[PDB]
Amino acid sequence: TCPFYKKIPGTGFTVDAFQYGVVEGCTAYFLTHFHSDHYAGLSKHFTFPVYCSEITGNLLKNKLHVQEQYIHPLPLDTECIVNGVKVVLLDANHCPGAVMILFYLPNGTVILHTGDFRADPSMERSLLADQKVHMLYLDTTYCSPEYTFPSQQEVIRFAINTAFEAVTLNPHALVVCGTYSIGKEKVFLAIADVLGSKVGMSQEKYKTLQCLNIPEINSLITTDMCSSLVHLLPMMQINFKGLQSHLKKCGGKYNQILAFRPTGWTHSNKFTRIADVIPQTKGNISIYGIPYSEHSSYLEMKRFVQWLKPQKIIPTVNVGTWKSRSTMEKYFREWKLEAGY
Ligand code: NI
């Protein structure tokens, strides 16, 4: 059965609620982004209207084979009417195609559902600036002050400088980047750009990337692995055994691997600056864990909420334990006392 925090009161609507079968009273299913915890349940046999971004809809049609007649793509930053209710989709600063959804209820209540997001001060100048929000359904993934990490720009600067140094020292080194889901594409695209290379990958990953409306993509990616010195591999193969095995396959073209694992936060963030990060090494293989996050840090989250001043907050992440829920409620009250709403 569908949990309450996936239902939008006063509507026929649900958000990211595809794994509960037919939800009683739901006339339109919204999907904020193409990540498996959120699309779980959708398949080619789904027969209700799905509302989403253009990019999400490309992935639903091409990767999940959802039939086209049930896919309803909406433009961003544009007032739209769905089953008689005004909605707006806003960029969530998450992965490609990810949105936040503003719902303007018939009774005058305004609800923001963030989906998954990385809060940014640029959101303070979207269509959110213009009106009051009564209820916020919030991505609370990193809702605790221990969760600190650098800007995406500092992390990319580290990666580009690390890769350019290694390959200039050793023209026979290969760079490998781990991937499992969409998101974080800037990691491998920025490295390939500094190296003057396309990025090489499997046909299935090329197919996924071709759904994302990235400008000039045909100039940046390829399935011809032999022509490329940046390769993408499944995240599970980013270890010494899997990388050794990959280097065999390259037919003596390369004699060294430098590999990157974009993670979320890890506890090494509570001790080390990005500048100071070092790899795990075995022989001619080195592996860097880099903290490239597509979710808000604690401080980013706090700033957004203190600016928006919602009347009520409903967390959508970390809701399964009483300890997590009590922790998050305590921070919500502090933020409200400190800012005065
Ligand atoms: Ni996500």
Side-chain angles (χ1 to χ4, degrees), residues 33 35 38 94 116:
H33 68 293
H35 281 161
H38 299 262
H94 187 53
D116 282 345

Side-chain angles (χ1 to χ4, degrees), residues 30-163:
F30 284 79
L31 179 55
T32 59
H33 68 293
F34 197 76
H35 281 161
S36 62
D37 281 351
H38 299 262
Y39 69 70
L42 267 165
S43 72
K44 72 140 61 151
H45 313 298
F46 197 81
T47 45
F48 295 97
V50 179
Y51 285 83
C52 58
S53 71
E54 179 183 357
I55 289 164
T56 298
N58 297 340
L59 295 156
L60 291 179
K61 180 197 178 160
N62 294 287
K63 302 289 293 189
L64 292 184
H65 307 290
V66 175
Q67 299 165 52
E68 184 152 79
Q69 72 180 138
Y70 305 111
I71 308 175
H72 296 261
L74 306 172
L76 300 190
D77 301 319
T78 300
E79 297 180 327
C80 296
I81 305 309
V82 172
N83 297 354
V85 181
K86 179 161 72 168
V87 303
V88 175
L89 300 187
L90 307 166
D91 205 280
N93 189 42
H94 187 53
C95 62
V99 298
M100 318 194 283
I101 312 162
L102 254 195
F103 298 94
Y104 293 83
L105 264 51
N107 70 6
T109 301
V110 180
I111 294 169
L112 173 68
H113 196 301
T114 65
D116 282 345
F117 87 142
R118 186 159 181 180
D120 195 74
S122 64
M123 296 172 174
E124 301 166 18
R125 298 169 279 285
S126 61
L127 310 191
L128 290 177
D130 310 49
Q131 93 290 277
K132 186 193 174 51
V133 169
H134 300 80
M135 317 183 72
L136 175 64
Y137 286 68
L138 177 61
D139 166 18
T140 45
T141 296
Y142 292 127
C143 191
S144 190
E146 76 266 27
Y147 297 116
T148 63
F149 34 72
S151 63
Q152 292 176 163
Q153 195 277 330
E154 294 171 78
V155 177
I156 289 302
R157 177 99 274 203
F158 174 84
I160 284 165
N161 289 354
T162 302

Side-chain angles (χ1 to χ4, degrees), residues 11 23 28 30 37 41 45 57 68 76 78 92 94 112 130 134 154 165 185 212 229 245 255 260 277 288 297 341:
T11 66
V23 176
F30 284 79
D37 281 351
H45 313 298
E68 184 152 79
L76 300 190
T78 300
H94 187 53
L112 173 68
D130 310 49
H134 300 80
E154 294 171 78
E165 174 172 319
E185 288 83 7
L212 311 179
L229 57 149
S245 185
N255 64 2
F260 293 92
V277 163
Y288 284 87
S297 74
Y341 52 102

Side-chain angles (χ1 to χ4, degrees), residues 163 167 173-177 191 195 229-231 256-260:
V167 171
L174 175 66
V175 176
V176 182
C177 295
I191 289 168
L195 302 174
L229 57 149
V230 182
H231 297 176
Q256 182 186 347
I257 284 175
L258 181 106
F260 293 92

